[PDB]
Design a protein around this nucleic acid. Structure first.
Ligand SMILES: [Mg+2]
Ligand SMILES: [Mg+2]
Lengths: 56, 119, 60, 123
RNA sequence: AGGACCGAACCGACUAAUGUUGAAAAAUUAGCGGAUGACUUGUGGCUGGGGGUGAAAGGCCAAUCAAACCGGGAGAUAGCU
RNA sequence: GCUCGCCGGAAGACCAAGGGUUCCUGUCCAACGUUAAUCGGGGCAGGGUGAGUCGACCCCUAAGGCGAGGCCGAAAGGCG
RNA sequence: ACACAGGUGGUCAGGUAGAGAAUACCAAGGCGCUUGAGAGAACUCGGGUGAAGGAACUAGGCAAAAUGGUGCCGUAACUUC
RNA sequence: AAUUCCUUGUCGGGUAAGUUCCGACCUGCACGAAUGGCGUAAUGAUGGCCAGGCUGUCUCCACCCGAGACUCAGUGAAAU
RNA sequence: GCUCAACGGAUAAAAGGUACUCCGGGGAUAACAGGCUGAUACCGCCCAAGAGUUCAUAUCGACGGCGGUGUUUGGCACCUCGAUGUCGGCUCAUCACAUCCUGGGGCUGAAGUAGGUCCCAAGGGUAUGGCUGUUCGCCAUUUAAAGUGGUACGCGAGCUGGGUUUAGAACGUCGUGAGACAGUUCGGUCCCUAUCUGCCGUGGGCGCUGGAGAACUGAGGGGGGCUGCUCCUAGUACGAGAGGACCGGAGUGGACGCAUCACUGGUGUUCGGGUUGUCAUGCCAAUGGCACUGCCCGGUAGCUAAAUGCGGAAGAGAUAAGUGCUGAAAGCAUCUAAGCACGAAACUUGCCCCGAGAUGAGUUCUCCCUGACCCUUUAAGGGUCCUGAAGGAACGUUGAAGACGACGACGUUGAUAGGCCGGGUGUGUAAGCGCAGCGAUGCGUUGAGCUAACCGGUACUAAUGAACCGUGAGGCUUAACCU
């Protein structure tokens, strides 16, 4: 229900051990607008797989 | 478990899943491309990719499921008059999915759904 | 066995209630008079004995 | 599949009308029994003068089940009435004589060659 | 005609699940009883603590009642922790 | 803006009581808002309530409250 | 003590169905209730359906299930009629 | 017996089986006549007992519908 | 001048109730539980008066005697009173052996059948209801049997709250009374989001001394083990008959567990039909929203049991009790002492599952890497420029895989989903058009129309070029070979 002792801050490191984030490995570069974007996602400009998939 | 099943609850009851794809498919036919979330595109691949099966071929009696879960007849007048003859030879796959970043206020994964022959 | 007098853990948590029966005839005799079971068992020894003298008597 | 507390009808001319199973027999911890089976029953309703009496405790064989008995083709045989034929407690033979309604082929045995010979209809 | 009848509002709170760091310092959801009278509810008015009031249960008197609250005697007194 | 959904002897309109700027515009997003907020009953700055007939006041009076004198009571006061 | 599932008096009474100010669906009118978005395990909270059996369950048919309107026929004990 | 210790008194009923209940039995441990006695239609969110109907109460649980739980963002307590 | 007699004498002078209660404190002191103790209790043993016709010792055992158990009632007041929640139930249990069923024996006052008692044996099995808060018990009817105990007389941060044990109320009873009753009867709030330990699952890290991909071996651990009945042997043995077997064999059950959806069903709010009231689609005709999915009627896939397949072994070893064989000590006798055989659901195996973090990190099988230099505290050294393999992760499509993770399938060469065609499937003969009928409605097209999860196909869409990660022949020591 509730603890009987104060937990050690060293345990607090051990509980937060697996709690770390994870960044992106590599960004998919466009081949026409020539810019990095998310793999299997469109660019910020509206490009995907080279072509202009959406006029913004 | 949901072995061999098919259907996402979408955290909504079935009467609202009914009534939401009314307007969502009801406006995609209008503007030919819209911004929605990706599970409301991926469950909508069980919905809108069959809601273009709605858009196959004109009779008189085929004006009616496109009244039924749509409450609309103007969009009926767009489908079999213009879009039926548009997609006259495509045997499936009338759409395309564009995962377009995340929604601001809740980090919801958005996407663009659209038609294949938009231009 | 236990009696079901009022008091609880003085009553129900002890074996203050006795029952003495007969092997060849089958004549039970209980007692729950005082708190002690030997104020009951030995009393139920007397009451079965009081039945026992009547067994020849009621028959005859 | 008849458990306790189950009202059954009567299939012979014994005299009872309503019986009720109080014990499933024939096996250790045997929770259920279908046709071809023996149950201890009481009698809840009888005719004003018959072979029986309201409250007699005796055995019976189960002959018609609403639940169903299967055959090796896959065909399951259900009924619309749950009736039984009353037996002796000791000789364990049927007491009545005139069998009412149809019965099944699972009922036939050396113990029950007697009933099917008196049955009006055997499937 | 009725301290009549079924039953809304209204009024009560009998059962059950909830809830028990709550939506809520007693409530909701389902039902329930009364619902033309010994009815219910406004606006005021009056009764003050060994007193009040009470179809009475030590009930109620500003979320507190076998002696209200606030201030003072008063740093009551404590062979007790 | 387009549908959709709910309430509808109300989740609509209207007052008293009570609140006392919340009202209307402009501006701002630190805090406040159980998240963001470009928004707000938030901040800031401006506005905005017009009466012989409506209400109060006012003229009556009830329960009641006070009380000249008056009566009673150590005093304070009690009753009228 | 909160932008609190509470409490708070008066006035107002559209349509269809309906005895009705019940209920339903609605109009006028007003809102979608201040975290969302996923996933579709146990597990509780609510719900719906259930073979055969029908109280055996249990302290206890608790709750659930069931009954339900309007006419008409018919209606026992007993009665303080 | 809302009163009876013994006491599950005895008998009858009821049930397959009834420490309950309903009839008697009177041996009233320790009823009793306005701190009333006995009876009583109607009445009761009153106590106990029995039946029909009814059904996941149960045998013996299965399956779906939602609200959380779990995943990700934003915020972010508690008793100890 | 005082039974100041509670007699070193609180006052001349003083009774109660409190379950409406309250403070101050106490494990200095009660009630449960633990503790010690074992009187009592329970369970054995010794003696043998005798009973048992005779015959103590088949069966029993007077009078007595000796132990064991902690298990009854107790004793004690050591833990706990700045809290250790108790009766019964329910849910789950687990242990003991002093064994209830099953197993193995010995003796019998054991013909058989059936028992009696004793010993071995704890693998597995070991009722439902009526009554009552129940426990217990009685009863009914089962069963192979309905074991007994340890467990805070197991189990309330799991449930229940009937009983006891608050305040309300009443009787009987007691007291003048307020009130009280191991007297009853009616009514009466069961809180806690889990830090740790423990447990059930499921991951991450690093390790196993070049790296990677696999297959395993199996240390060790777990699961599992029940039984009736019928028939044969056989009416055989036995017995006078009645009755009725051993052993061996077959069949079918019960109960349990695993697997499963072909069947038989349930469910199937996403398939379909019927239908009520209302609202809207200009209006009819059609639909649709809402009304618990509005109310029904049904049904695919899936999930499911009540639906159907297995499962308990046989076998081996070593044995327990027990039976022996040779055989001295002990010219005989003698299962023991030397030797030696048999002997049970216990044991170890045989059965399945887990399993090399088995740090003792094992095994075999396959793939990858054969670039350059500086530094000084010269080595399992540090750094720099080329190189980036096997493969890996990441990302997307996804799953009869899943809380997440993990797992599995697939990413254009491609069938991974979705879509599409084909098919089946299920509601049950659509709409519109005719036709008849005053009409409601019926008939013609008509298993038509529709069709969720499904079966066969289809690249129609969505599964991206890359990049990332991991590198560049792998310590020392002898040893053995080869040169
Ligand atoms: Mg942490
Ligand atoms: Mg012994």
């Amino acid at each position: 229900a509730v603890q009987q002792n104060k937990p050690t801050r060293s345990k607090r490191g051990m509980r937060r051990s697996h709690d770390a984030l994870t960044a992106v490995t590599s960004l998919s570069v466009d081949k026409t607008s020539g810019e990095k974007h998310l793999r299997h996602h469109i660019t910020a400009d509206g490009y995907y797989r080279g072509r202009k998939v959406i006029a913004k | 478990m949901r072995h061999r099943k098919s259907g996402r609850q979408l955290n909504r009851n079935s009467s609202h899943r009914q009534a939401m794809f009314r307007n969502m498919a009801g406006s995609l036919v209008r503007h030919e491309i819209i911004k929605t979330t990706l599970p409301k595109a991926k469950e909508l691949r069980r919905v809108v990719e069959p809601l273009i099966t709605l858009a196959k071929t004109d009779s008189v009696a085929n004006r009616r499921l496109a009244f039924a879960r749509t409450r609309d007849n103007e969009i009926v007048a767009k489908l079999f008059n213009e879009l039926g003859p548009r997609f006259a030879s495509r045997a499936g796959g009338y759409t395309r999915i564009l995962k377009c970043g995340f929604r601001a206020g809740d980090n919801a994964p958005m996407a663009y759904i659209e038609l294949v022959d938009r231009s | 066995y236990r009696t079901s007098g009022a008091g609880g853990q003085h009553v129900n948590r002890t074996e203050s209630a006795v029952r003495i029966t007969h092997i060849p005839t089958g004549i039970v005799t209980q007692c729950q008079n005082d708190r002690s079971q030997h104020k009951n068992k030995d009393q139920a020894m007397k009451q079965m004995k009081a039945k026992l003298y009547e067994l020849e008597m009621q028959k005859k | 599949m008849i458990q306790e507390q189950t009202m059954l009808n009567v299939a012979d001319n014994s005299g009872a009308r309503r019986v009720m199973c109080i014990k499933v027999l024939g096996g250790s911890h045997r929770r259920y029994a279908g046709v071809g089976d023996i149950i201890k029953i009481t009698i809840k309703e009888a005719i004003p003068r018959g072979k029986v009496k309201k409250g007699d405790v005796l055995k019976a064989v189960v002959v018609r089940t609403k639940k169903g008995v299967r055959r090796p083709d896959g065909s399951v045989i259900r009924f619309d009435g749950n009736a039984c034929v009353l037996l002796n407690n000791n000789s364990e033979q049927p007491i009545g004589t005139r069998i009412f309604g149809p019965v099944t082929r699972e009922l036939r045995s050396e113990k029950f060659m007697k009933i099917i010979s008196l049955a009006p209809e055997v499937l």
